[PDB]
């Protein structure tokens, strides 16, 4: 989720993803641990048989054919972690995620409470104002001509520099704000 995506998925990426999906769905099928371990090792062994195959056409024939088998026995109700995109608590706490700039709209009587927090916030705002002005030039000079080719950002290269476009990545609300 954090890393930028690639222009495509290689054959080894596809086989690894298929291995991951198949092993997760077999764990969903095999509730008990010993049965799952035995069948997972049997599946791993079966998987490793075609490991040294060099024919690309044959390589294409492998896995895609397996994918059809995976689709046939894909356990229509697989196990999903609670916070995963299919879990029962996927977006439970998105309603508690309040943006940071909202604090700029607080009444002064409210800002009277928590003064140290707002002082540190002012220091953060100063740092952002300087760093963004540096980052604009840094990204303008480092970006390839004709526009970027991959949505990955370069790190900071000087001493006082900060990572470009950092304000909204560092200032995430929290995973569980309340």
């Amino acid at each position: 989720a954090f890393s930028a995506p690639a222009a495509y998925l290689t054959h080894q990426q596809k086989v690894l993803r298929l291995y991951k999906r198949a092993l997760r769905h077999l764990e969903s099928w095999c509730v008990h641990r010993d049965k799952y371990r035995y069948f997972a090792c049997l599946m791993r062994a079966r998987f490793d048989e075609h490991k040294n195959e060099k024919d690309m056409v044959k390589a294409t024939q492998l896995l895609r054919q397996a994918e059809e088998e995976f689709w046939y026995g894909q356990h229509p109700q697989p196990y999903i972690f609670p916070e995963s995109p299919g879990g029962t608590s996927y977006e439970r706490y998105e309603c508690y995620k309040v943006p940071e700039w909202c604090l700029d709209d607080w009444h002064p009587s409210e800002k009277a409470m928590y003064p140290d927090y707002f002082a540190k916030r002012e220091q953060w705002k100063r740092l952002r104002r300087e760093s963004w002005e540096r980052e604009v030039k840094q990204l303008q000079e480092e970006t390839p001509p004709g526009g970027p080719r991959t949505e990955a950002l370069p790190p900071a290269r000087k001493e006082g520099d900060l990572p470009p476009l950092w304000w909204h990545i560092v200032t995430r609300p929290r995973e569980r704000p309340m």
């Binding site: 998105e94 309603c95 508690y96 995620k97 709209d105």
Partner: protein, 459 residues
């Protein structure tokens, strides 16, 4: 009746002789006082009417509409106070003058002992609305919307004047009391058919009827907040009041005549409620919901039974208040976002909780949740239609379901979910906006305690 009219007229010199920074304060206070004065008219009799003079009378169909018309002006002033801040004093005074003139025309329209006076004021209300729409409008299509609104109305109403003068030439009087006591049956003739059409289509266009409802989305979307409020709350009810007043002369011709309209409205409520489901605009969605409600009111008036009339009156009042509240909420969102599209600003409940509560209450009262007067009118009209025919309920059923859907859809798209990351100019809701919503919503929940006060003369 002059105890209400004269203060409304005096509102104009008071506004124009006001200090440059005291117009809003003076206007709101005196408008609220005039509204309080209007409350006296509510104490109706089971007898004929409150005939003040030869020119004006009151009725328990006219009294709730008059009270609502008076109450709407302070709300419109408070809503307009925001976006007219960078505006010269003369033009703000002109805006307030136009609002006052609109109120005066509506007040004289609702009493109107005589039909030609009623028509004159009914069409006099057109000029201030047109000027408000085409002058203090944001987009470039306000001119086209004003043209549509003017010409639909005039095309509908020009035959009405000819029909009225013909009716006075034959009968000898256009007075409401004389017409009611001397009503005689209309023979099923081609000339009588065209007279019926001329008498009915003018009020049908302003409801508006499903076939003739195009002007309304344009006018509502392009008008300012005060214009949208006055269009949705009062100006749509003029057609219903006119139909209830003029239908007495029409019988027994109405039964055969009513079928094209009954079918158009029963299918158009479904069509417009379904249109509401796929909309990218708040104002258009509210406009189409208004069209559906007024189609139901058309059905109620055309059935022409006592329960139909009581349901139509209650539904008109409830829809006026609810639609004004909905437009106010949409305008509060727009003044922050400047986009007026639902899908852009999302998750506003996290940032504005009290405004989300107001949204929930408005959507619930638009959904016709009992024992609100919205559902009182809904149920009375549904029962009358069922007595008219046991099949109508099916259509009504669909309508109710669809209504709820889009209502909660509008509640879910803008208030629930995740707030858009980029928008950062969402400031805390002002006291003025919260007061506006409270003043919109409290009368509904007060009226549900005394439903008979808005059930019309057939109670």
């Amino acid at each position: 009746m002059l105890k209400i009219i004269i203060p409304t007229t005096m509102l104009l010199p008071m506004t124009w002789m006001s200090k440059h920074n005291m117009i809003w304060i003076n206007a709101t206070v005196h408008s609220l006082l005039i509204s309080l004065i209007s409350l006296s008219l509510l104490n109706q009799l089971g007898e004929n009417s409150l005939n003040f003079s030869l020119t004006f009378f009151s009725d328990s169909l006219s009294a709730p509409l008059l009270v609502l018309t008076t109450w709407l002006l302070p709300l419109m002033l408070m809503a307009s106070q925001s976006h007219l801040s960078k505006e010269t004093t003369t033009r703000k005074k002109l805006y307030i003058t136009m609002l006052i003139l609109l109120q005066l025309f509506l007040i004289m329209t609702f009493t109107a002992t005589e039909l030609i006076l009623f028509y004159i004021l009914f069409e006099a209300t057109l000029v201030p609305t047109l000027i408000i729409i085409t002058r203090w409008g944001n987009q470039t299509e306000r001119l086209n919307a004003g043209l549509y609104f003017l010409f639909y109305t005039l095309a509908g109403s020009l035959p009405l004047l000819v029909a009225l003068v013909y009716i006075q030439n034959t009968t000898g009087s256009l007075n409401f009391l004389i017409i009611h006591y001397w009503s005689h049956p209309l023979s099923n003739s081609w000339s009588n058919i065209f007279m019926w059409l001329a008498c009915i289509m003018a009020f049908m266009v302003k409801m508006p009827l499903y076939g003739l409802h195009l002007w309304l989305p344009k006018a509502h979307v392009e008008a300012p907040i005060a214009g949208s409020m006055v269009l949705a709350a009062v100006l749509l009810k003029l057609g219903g009041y006119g139909m209830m007043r003029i239908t007495t002369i029409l019988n027994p011709l109405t039964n055969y005549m009513a079928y094209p309209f009954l079918m158009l409205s029963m299918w158009g409520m479904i069509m417009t409620s379904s249109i509401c489901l796929r909309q990218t605009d708040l104002k258009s969605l509210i406009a189409y919901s208004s069209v559906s409600h007024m189609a139901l009111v058309i059905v109620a008036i055309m059935i022409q039974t006592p329960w139909s009339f009581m349901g139509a009156t209650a539904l008109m009042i409830a829809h006026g208040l609810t639609s004004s509240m909905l437009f106010c909420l949409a305008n509060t969102n727009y003044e922050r976002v400047h986009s007026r599209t639902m899908i852009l600003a999302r998750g506003l409940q996290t940032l504005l909780p009290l405004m989300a509560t107001w949204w929930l209450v408005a959507s619930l009262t638009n959904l016709a949740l009992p024992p609100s007067i919205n559902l009182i009118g809904e149920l009375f009209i549904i029962t009358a239609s069922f007595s008219w025919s046991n099949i109508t309920i099916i259509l009504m059923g669909m309508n109710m379901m669809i209504t709820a859907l889009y209502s909660l859809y509008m509640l879910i798209t803008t208030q629930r979910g995740k707030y858009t990351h980029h928008i950062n100019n969402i400031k805390p809701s002002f006291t003025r906006e919260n007061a506006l919503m409270a003043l919109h919503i409290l009368p509904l929940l007060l009226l549900t305690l005394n439903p008979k006060m808005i059930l019309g003369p057939l109670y």
